[PDB]
Amino acid sequence: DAQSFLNRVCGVSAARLTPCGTGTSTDVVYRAFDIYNDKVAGFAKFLKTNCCRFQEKDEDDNLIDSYFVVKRHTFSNYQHEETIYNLLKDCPAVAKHDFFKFRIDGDMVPHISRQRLTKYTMADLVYALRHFDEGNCDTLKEILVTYNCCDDDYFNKKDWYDFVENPDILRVYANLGERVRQALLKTVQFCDAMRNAGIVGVLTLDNQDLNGNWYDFGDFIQTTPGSGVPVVDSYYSLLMPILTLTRALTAESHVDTDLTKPYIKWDLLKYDFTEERLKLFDRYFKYWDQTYHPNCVNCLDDRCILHCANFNVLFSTVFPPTSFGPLVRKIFVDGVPFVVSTGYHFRELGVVHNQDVNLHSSRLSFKELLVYAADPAMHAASGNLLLDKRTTCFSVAA
Amino acid sequence: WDLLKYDFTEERLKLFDRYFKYWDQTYHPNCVNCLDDRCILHCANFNVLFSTVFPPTSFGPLVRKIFVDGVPFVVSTGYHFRELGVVHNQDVNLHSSRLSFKELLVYAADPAMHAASGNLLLDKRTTCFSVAA
Amino acid sequence: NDALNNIINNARDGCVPLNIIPLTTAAKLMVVIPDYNTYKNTCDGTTFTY
Amino acid sequence: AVGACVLCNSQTSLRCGACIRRPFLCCKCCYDHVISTSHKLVLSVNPYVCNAPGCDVTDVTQLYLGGMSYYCKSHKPPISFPLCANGQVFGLYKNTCVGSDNVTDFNAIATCDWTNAGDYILANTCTERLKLFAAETLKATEETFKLSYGIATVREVLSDRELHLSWEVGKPRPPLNRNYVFTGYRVTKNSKVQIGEYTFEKGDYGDAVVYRGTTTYKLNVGDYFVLTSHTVMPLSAPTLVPQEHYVRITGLYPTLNISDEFSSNVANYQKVGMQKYSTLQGPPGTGKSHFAIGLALYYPSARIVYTACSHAAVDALCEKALKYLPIDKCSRIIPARARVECFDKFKVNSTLEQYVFCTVNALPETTADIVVFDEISMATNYDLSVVNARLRAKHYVYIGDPAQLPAPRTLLTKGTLEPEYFNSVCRLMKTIGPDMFLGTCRRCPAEIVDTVSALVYDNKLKAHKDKSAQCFKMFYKGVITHDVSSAINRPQIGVVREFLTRNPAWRKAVFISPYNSQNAVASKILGLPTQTVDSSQGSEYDYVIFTQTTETAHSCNVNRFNVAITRAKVGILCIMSDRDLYDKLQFTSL
Ligand SMILES: Nc1ncnc2c1ncn2[C@@H]1O[C@H](COP(=O)(O)OP(=O)(O)O)[C@@H](O)[C@H]1O
Ligand SMILES: Nc1ncnc2c1ncn2[C@@H]1O[C@H](COP(=O)(O)OP(=O)(O)O)[C@@H](O)[C@H]1O
Ligand SMILES: [Mg+2]
Ligand SMILES: [Mg+2]
Ligand SMILES: [Zn+2]
Ligand SMILES: [Zn+2]
Numbered sequence A: 001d002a003q004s005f006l007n008r009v010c011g012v013s014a015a016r017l018t019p020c021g022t023g024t025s026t027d028v029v030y031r032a033f034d035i036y037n038d039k040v041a042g043f044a045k046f047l048k049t050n051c052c053r054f055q056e057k058d059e060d061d062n063l064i065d066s067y068f069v070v071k072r073h074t075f076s077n078y079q080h081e082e083t084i085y086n087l088l089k090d091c092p093a094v095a096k097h098d099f100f101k102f103r104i105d106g107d108m109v110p111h112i113s114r115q116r117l118t119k120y121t122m123a124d125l126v127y128a129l130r131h132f133d134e135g136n137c138d139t140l141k142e143i144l145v146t147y148n149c150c151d152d153d154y155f156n157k158k159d160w161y162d163f164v165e166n167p168d169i170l171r172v173y174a175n176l177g178e179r180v181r182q183a184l185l186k187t188v189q190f191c192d193a194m195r196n197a198g199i200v201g202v203l204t205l206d207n208q209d210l211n212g213n214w215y216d217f218g219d220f221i222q223t224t225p226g227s228g229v230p231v232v233d234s235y236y237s238l239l240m241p242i243l244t245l246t247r248a249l250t251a252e253s254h255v256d257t258d259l260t261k262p263y264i265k266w267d268l269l270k271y272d273f274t275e276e277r278l279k280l281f282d283r284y285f286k287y288w289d290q291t292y293h294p295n296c297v298n299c300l301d302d303r304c305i306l307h308c309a310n311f312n313v314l315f316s317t318v319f320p321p322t323s324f325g326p327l328v329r330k331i332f333v334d335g336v337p338f339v340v341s342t343g344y345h346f347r348e349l350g351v352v353h354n355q356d357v358n359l360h361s362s363r364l365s366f367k368e369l370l371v372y373a374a375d376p377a378m379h380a381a382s383g384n385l386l387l388d389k390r391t392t393c394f395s396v397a398a
Numbered sequence B: 001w002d003l004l005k006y007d008f009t010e011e012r013l014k015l016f017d018r019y020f021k022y023w024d025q026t027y028h029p030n031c032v033n034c035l036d037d038r039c040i041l042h043c044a045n046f047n048v049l050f051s052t053v054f055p056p057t058s059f060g061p062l063v064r065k066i067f068v069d070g071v072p073f074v075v076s077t078g079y080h081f082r083e084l085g086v087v088h089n090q091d092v093n094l095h096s097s098r099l100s101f102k103e104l105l106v107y108a109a110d111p112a113m114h115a116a117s118g119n120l121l122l123d124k125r126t127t128c129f130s131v132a133a
Numbered sequence C: 001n002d003a004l005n006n007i008i009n010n011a012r013d014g015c016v017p018l019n020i021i022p023l024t025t026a027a028k029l030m031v032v033i034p035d036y037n038t039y040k041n042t043c044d045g046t047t048f049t050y
Numbered sequence D: 001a002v003g004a005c006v007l008c009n010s011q012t013s014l015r016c017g018a019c020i021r022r023p024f025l026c027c028k029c030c031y032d033h034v035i036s037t038s039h040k041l042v043l044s045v046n047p048y049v050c051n052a053p054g055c056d057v058t059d060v061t062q063l064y065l066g067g068m069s070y071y072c073k074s075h076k077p078p079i080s081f082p083l084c085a086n087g088q089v090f091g092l093y094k095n096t097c098v099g100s101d102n103v104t105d106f107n108a109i110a111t112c113d114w115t116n117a118g119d120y121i122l123a124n125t126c127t128e129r130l131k132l133f134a135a136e137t138l139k140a141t142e143e144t145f146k147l148s149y150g151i152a153t154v155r156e157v158l159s160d161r162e163l164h165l166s167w168e169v170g171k172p173r174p175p176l177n178r179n180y181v182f183t184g185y186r187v188t189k190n191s192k193v194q195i196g197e198y199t200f201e202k203g204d205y206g207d208a209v210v211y212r213g214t215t216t217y218k219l220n221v222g223d224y225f226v227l228t229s230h231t232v233m234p235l236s237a238p239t240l241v242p243q244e245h246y247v248r249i250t251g252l253y254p255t256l257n258i259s260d261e262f263s264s265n266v267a268n269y270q271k272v273g274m275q276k277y278s279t280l281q282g283p284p285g286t287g288k289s290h291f292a293i294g295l296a297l298y299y300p301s302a303r304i305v306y307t308a309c310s311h312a313a314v315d316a317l318c319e320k321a322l323k324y325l326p327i328d329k330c331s332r333i334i335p336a337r338a339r340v341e342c343f344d345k346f347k348v349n350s351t352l353e354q355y356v357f358c359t360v361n362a363l364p365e366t367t368a369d370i371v372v373f374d375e376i377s378m379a380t381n382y383d384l385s386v387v388n389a390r391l392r393a394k395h396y397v398y399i400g401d402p403a404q405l406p407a408p409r410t411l412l413t414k415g416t417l418e419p420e421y422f423n424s425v426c427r428l429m430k431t432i433g434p435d436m437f438l439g440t441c442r443r444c445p446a447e448i449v450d451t452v453s454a455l456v457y458d459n460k461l462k463a464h465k466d467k468s469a470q471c472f473k474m475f476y477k478g479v480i481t482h483d484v485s486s487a488i489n490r491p492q493i494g495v496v497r498e499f500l501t502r503n504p505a506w507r508k509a510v511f512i513s514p515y516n517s518q519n520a521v522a523s524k525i526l527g528l529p530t531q532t533v534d535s536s537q538g539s540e541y542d543y544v545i546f547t548q549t550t551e552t553a554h555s556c557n558v559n560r561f562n563v564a565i566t567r568a569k570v571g572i573l574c575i576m577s578d579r580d581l582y583d584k585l586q587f588t589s590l
């Protein structure tokens, strides 16, 4: 029956459910899978027909962003998914499943019930912000509204999406930063649980809801415990442009990484953030198995410079903007003290040190005059301090 | 101090450059990089004072959860000396299959197994640090 | 295994000092108390904090 | 190390280095072994090799013990002596080595390569302490024959029902009967892990597979199949315990008001509970597992452990337990690798259950009260030793059938084994007969059933029907081509296809042939489903068509017609070129 089925979907978890389907039938939705098998591949927007959806309503009969997906498939898939869920049950970054067999006609169909998921997933947000279309964007407006990033009257604006007629869309997008960062942390926890439990699988963006819980174990091969590896090549890479569009790491500039705490009171003279970059990489992109060099001077080739620079361009958004720029050093020429730039701290290439510094020089040839006059260390050191309020760009000296 | 922190190389270098700044001999916080047996003594002499400002729980063996035969060990893959700094084992086998008598001897001799398995101890009879019972 | 896995996953290299394994994962603690003043100072009552 | 001699159980520390397993021999027995055959390598706690800085001397009879080491004539110290002297070879316990005369058949069991049939004829008549070593070395030489073989790999994901295979070129691709398992491997970044253990079956067109599955992991491009490499691993327990009798039902107490659908089995269960071990011969279509459920429910309170050597049988008993047995008090045993599509709906993997379902492949060393062994002709003496060592029970029952599939014994090619030499328990079921049988056939009409029960049985089978009378035997001339390693007879099929328009009945016709190439080309010219004789023993049909290519030893063995033609329930069009298969089953002439 349509009511007994819903009452079974309830289970021990006390909640009320409003059927998005119709009479214990599969509800057809139009989602944004990341799928790769031998016949279809790519990150495309598909149409899934294997999940009856029920929306949980809290006090006041208000329909909230918490659903009950009760996907049904064959018996042996139910078997394998129960076993893998039992191996991965203790992890907090796993959606609370519920396994039960139910009567439909005269025959027992097994239904796996995922509890308290968001309406959309990680892949939906990534596809909405990566395949944007100003004429047809309803899965982005709904995500922006349902998480209080905007007020649903922001979309009545003359230009709510343009980056040059509306810089406030950056502030709007930044409200998803703490929803994406927690998703990243839960991905790390889930990967740690898979590694300890000895399960080999591929993490896709469509298997993690917007809260951060993982709920799909269809192709998760188990092995000897402690020797399993997660495949996150296709997870972190598609999500990568979102980590700076929504500024997902802006909570790392606060002490204890808490958005209510004040800013980290960084030292002015500190310019070598290699340890902080490594800590951030091992906290967020822990199972990204490629080598990461914070300073690009150690890179293997021109395909390793791009990769480490890509990681650095985000890891440099949590460090103070005054710590970049040239690295000056008081040298002495002819007994008189210069102050010249003996390096650079790139936001992308990390810290680069000059191989030829002459701390005690005697004669300055035309090459040396040219170099010591071209660099801004002389002028910025000699010049007066400037505070220009006409622009938001950093001002050094006048 | 953080409990899980064991690599104090940056703190040792900062202390050396703050106090013994113009001591022009080279100072290696980890003695594994030393030039010879006359460089081990010098850096160890600097470390034996520089290790009196760090917590006493950060020294001792550096354990690491390895897996043998599908079962998780916890064994010591190094040491953080007060004098020789941080020393890492060159031969760690994270995924081992068969344990020979040498491997049983090594994994039974080290205190990582016993201290990890044992109960926590607080002995007020002595001022020395107590690990486990 | 649970608290041990937590503190190992919290680590960067996967290496932690041995002296903190019982400090953060041991479920049972024993205090050896030589005289009464130390008993009054470390574990007075039925609950104490170490 | 130190232990007991294999053929006199005397204390010794010698291993003959030229053997396969290198077993224990005492000084007398090792000496006798190293004079007779070419075996000239012996291992003590230290090897009997010449301990010169550089030399190659291994024969002990020209090896000399000098001081602390062993040397040959070329470099020995002037001090004696030859190790092989005084009718003995040097080693531990010179005072307690009893001589024997079993060195002849011991050499016959050791130096043989198990190719001809006489090796298996000779491996079962010996004193059975030597039979364990014979079984161990036979399994070991099977393993080393298996290790010199090539791997497989799947092409792609082709279909759920059928797959296609790609093979590295150079070394032969196998016969695909279900008995040859292939272990899959996820060769992913950078690890190699087991996932599935498939077999395959002969294809339809060119390269194709009708398969049987292990795990729901979908197999991608990076999956290549190794056959298997599970080692032979030493055995101690005998294949059979002695038959001892008890006055009453010892260790087992009955229930009250059990059931009545198997009401002709209570005294059988009593005779089971009387003596030590019992055997039941099960002809095709009797409900052997139903008898197992009934005997288990007669004593619903003690250990009944179900063991089947093969996993088709454990699937059959699992669905049987669902049909009859109470559910929660049952346990299937899953191996560490989950070797097949394991049926996991019970209290699976519980060593503290009562009704335990398991395989000899992954038995735990637990206790039992009465144990149930299944599909005996499958079970080799090595597996019998394994099940006796790991499982111990007060009473035993062994159910199986000699006339069905025996153990494969892939090394045997020349000489068909007789049914008692399949294993020891089959010998027990022939020599003194079975301790029980279920005499009833429920598929075969009267004429066919009493012809099979007249050929081999003691007329134990009847028919719960009257003859259907479309069971025909034809006089087919059978022009052969055999332009393949197998045998092909297409014009004989053309004659059969020139019939079948006078018979509107069997158009769902199931092609059954003992020859593989004809099986493959059967569904080519005519659209009728085709299945070899290896698809038998578990499936039953109503309409079977048989085309015999040749009259040879492969087509003369009667067990194999017994497993092929019993599948037909109401009709078989059996077409042969043999003049001898003829009066055995008196069909119509036409
Ligand atoms: N044709 C199909 N119909 C329904 N389910 C399928 C089909 N093929 C595979 N599946 C199962 O569905 C899973 C993917 O489901 P998906 O649409 O991603 O929903 P969810 O994210 O809830 O699993 C796979 O792991 C697989 O086990
Ligand atoms: N107690 C019983 N009463 C009547 N028929 C039985 C009984 N037990 C088994 N049978 C018959 O035996 C057959 C069982 O066949 P199957 O289930 O393939 O097992 P098996 O291959 O061991 O005979 C059935 O056709 C059934 O009619
Ligand atoms: Mg999915
Ligand atoms: Mg049966
Ligand atoms: Zn690099
Ligand atoms: Zn040094």
Ligand SMILES: [Zn+2]
Residues within 6 Å of the ligand: D016, D017, D018, D019, D033, D039, D110
């Ligand atoms: Zn020998």
Ligand SMILES: [Zn+2]
Residues within 6 Å of the ligand: D005, D006, D007, D008, D009, D010, D025, D026, D027, D028, D029, D030, D098
């Ligand atoms: Zn002997």
Ligand SMILES: [Zn+2]
Residues within 6 Å of the ligand: D050, D051, D052, D055, D056, D057, D071, D072, D073, D074, D075
């Ligand atoms: Zn020699």
